[PDB]
Amino acid sequence: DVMDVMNRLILAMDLMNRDDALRVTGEVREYIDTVKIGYPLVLSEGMDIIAEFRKRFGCRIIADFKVADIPETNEKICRATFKAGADAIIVHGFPGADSVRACLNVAEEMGREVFLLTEMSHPGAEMFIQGAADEIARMGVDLGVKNYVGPSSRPERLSRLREIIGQDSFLISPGVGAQGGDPGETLRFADAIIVGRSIYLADNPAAAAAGIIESIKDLL
Amino acid sequence: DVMDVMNRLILAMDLMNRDDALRVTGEVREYIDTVKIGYPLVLSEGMDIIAEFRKRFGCRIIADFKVADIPETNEKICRATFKAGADAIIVHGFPGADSVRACLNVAEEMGREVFLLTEMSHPGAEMFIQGAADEIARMGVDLGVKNYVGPSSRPERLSRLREIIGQDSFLISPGVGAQGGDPGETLRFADAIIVGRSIYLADNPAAAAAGIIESIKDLL
Ligand SMILES: O=c1cc(O)n([C@@H]2O[C@H](COP(=O)(O)O)[C@@H](O)[C@H]2O)c(=O)[nH]1
Ligand SMILES: O=c1cc(O)n([C@@H]2O[C@H](COP(=O)(O)O)[C@@H](O)[C@H]2O)c(=O)[nH]1
């Protein structure tokens, strides 16, 4: 048993201005309790933005840092990220098992979680990532990873990834809306959908979030 | 014709405390004019550290951010990084051509450079990256990439990557010292070596740098 994030919907907050990011996040907080913060916001406004969001909104924070370095550097990135208050960090699987294990070790030390990114949602993912993705997922299973990221834009791939990681793993999925993925279809396989632009570029982000949730009401 | 970095030696400044990072960098500045700053330092001390180093030391700065996202996010990361004053940014090739092109476009807009990371130096690189690395390098060539990163720990791989990118491309190489790579052998194929721990953890970082340079004097 694992509790769903609110409405199975995670906000990808990739606005690069603190005031805009705070405005939109506050506007959709009644619908979303889990926010993904990545480098567009962090490199513009600083790591302190993580604790600020956590305090102001009382939301979960996933640091989407696509950690993709050697083990020693990965350990340092993870430590800094958890010190900043992130609940979880997203790590690339493609650099291999030692790089992932380094992140898992720090997460264990600090009482936090790692999400393993398997296949990516964009067209370029077909070149190198897709062919390795099943094996990346199996590596995750072998390492004891319980949380995964896979692509809304390829539900047949998402289904295959779900098959590899099992029903007990937690799977979140970006590529919904702007990149062409469908909320309902994605939630056949993923526990939660990640949505950025379709919400944060909307004239009314709250209405956009509400509309997405309405379209998946029967899956909640 | 391209000018070598001073002594063909790039410092990987992965200390996480500003005072320590400034001390070590200042101590070795007579030997090294090009510094690689990554997320260990940036996530601990902020993006302002890039401009501070540039001003205080008058050195080149390579932002080692292993950029590894979708095109839209990559563009944002690159813009923030060049705004912060970085001369170049390191981008992963594994996510594919569109993701790389997004970084190249921003570099072109802002008069900066992209380095393409092909094969990595750590053991886990053997699992997925190594098998794709030749094709990643060829993709770089096709995209007009002129600057590359490849592994000191596998000189036979470094040689192959040099063959693919040609003599006119600029190639820098980490994994020297701590990870087992040899300065002189690496410089048979790479234009410059990247060195972190062997310098920054030394009792006397200046002496460590001087020693490395002494060992490769005939290649300068
Ligand atoms: O495969 C992936 C993995 C991601 O983390 N992402 C991230 O998920 C978000 C997608 O946002 P959007 O809904 O605006 O397309 C972005 O933050 C992107 O960096 C992705 O798009 N595809
Ligand atoms: O394949 C690669 C690519 C890298 O950027 N690096 C980076 O180069 C540096 C190696 O530092 P060191 O000399 O302490 O091993 C680190 O900053 C690491 O993140 C690497 O080690 N291997």
Side-chain angles (χ1 to χ4, degrees), chain A residues 14 16 39-40 42-44 47 64-66 68-73 76-77 80-81 92-99 120-125 127-129 132 135-136 139 179 197 200, chain B residues 14 16 39-40 42-44 47 64-66 68-73 76-77 80-81 92-99 120-125 127-129 132 135-136 139 179 197 200:
Chain A
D14 297 310
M16 299 177 71
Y39 285 134
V42 162
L43 300 184
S44 295
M47 288 287 278
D64 183 7
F65 290 174
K66 294 201 178 52
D69 218 303
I70 69 168
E72 287 83 353
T73 298
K76 291 174 180 187
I77 294 173
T81 299
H92 262 295
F94 80 76
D98 52 357
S99 290
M120 289 180 72
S121 61
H122 65 296
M127 295 184 62
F128 309 111
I129 290 167
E135 283 300 315
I136 289 168
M139 176 193 69
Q179 298 178 58
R197 286 166 285 172
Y200 72 69
Chain B
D14 298 311
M16 299 175 69
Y39 284 135
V42 161
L43 300 185
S44 296
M47 288 287 278
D64 183 7
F65 291 174
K66 303 281 188 318
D69 218 303
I70 68 169
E72 287 83 356
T73 298
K76 290 172 178 181
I77 294 172
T81 299
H92 262 295
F94 205 87
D98 52 358
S99 290
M120 290 180 71
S121 63
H122 64 296
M127 295 185 62
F128 309 112
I129 292 169
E135 287 298 331
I136 289 168
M139 176 191 70
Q179 296 179 59
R197 285 167 286 171
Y200 73 69

Side-chain angles (χ1 to χ4, degrees), chain B residues 13 26 28 68 107 117-118 126 131 139 148 158 165 171 184 189:
Chain B
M13 175 40 59
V28 305
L117 175 56
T118 62
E126 293 182 347
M139 176 191 70
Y148 296 83
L158 201 60
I165 67 181
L171 174 57
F189 309 111

Side-chain angles (χ1 to χ4, degrees), chain B residues 70-121:
Chain B
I70 68 169
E72 287 83 356
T73 298
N74 279 10
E75 176 187 349
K76 290 172 178 181
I77 294 172
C78 290
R79 188 165 290 104
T81 299
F82 298 137
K83 175 172 177 177
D87 294 291
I89 195 170
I90 297 172
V91 176
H92 262 295
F94 205 87
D98 52 358
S99 290
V100 177
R101 182 176 294 109
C103 302
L104 293 169
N105 290 339
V106 178
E108 181 173 8
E109 178 180 346
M110 305 186 68
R112 309 298 173 79
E113 300 280 340
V114 165
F115 280 70
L116 186 67
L117 175 56
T118 62
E119 184 166 332
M120 290 180 71
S121 63

Side-chain angles (χ1 to χ4, degrees), chain B residues 18-82:
Chain B
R18 173 174 168 275
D19 291 323
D20 296 332
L22 293 171
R23 181 190 73 247
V24 172
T25 304
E27 286 174 349
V28 305
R29 179 59 180 86
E30 56 177 299
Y31 301 106
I32 295 171
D33 73 353
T34 303
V35 180
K36 189 176 74 63
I37 293 182
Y39 284 135
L41 183 51
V42 161
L43 300 185
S44 296
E45 297 287 359
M47 288 287 278
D48 286 350
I49 200 72
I50 290 169
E52 182 174 19
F53 263 55
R54 273 267 229 103
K55 163 224 173 188
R56 282 192 52 146
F57 305 118
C59 58
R60 313 188 177 92
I61 300 293
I62 300 172
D64 183 7
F65 291 174
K66 303 281 188 318
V67 184
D69 218 303
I70 68 169
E72 287 83 356
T73 298
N74 279 10
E75 176 187 349
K76 290 172 178 181
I77 294 172
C78 290
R79 188 165 290 104
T81 299
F82 298 137

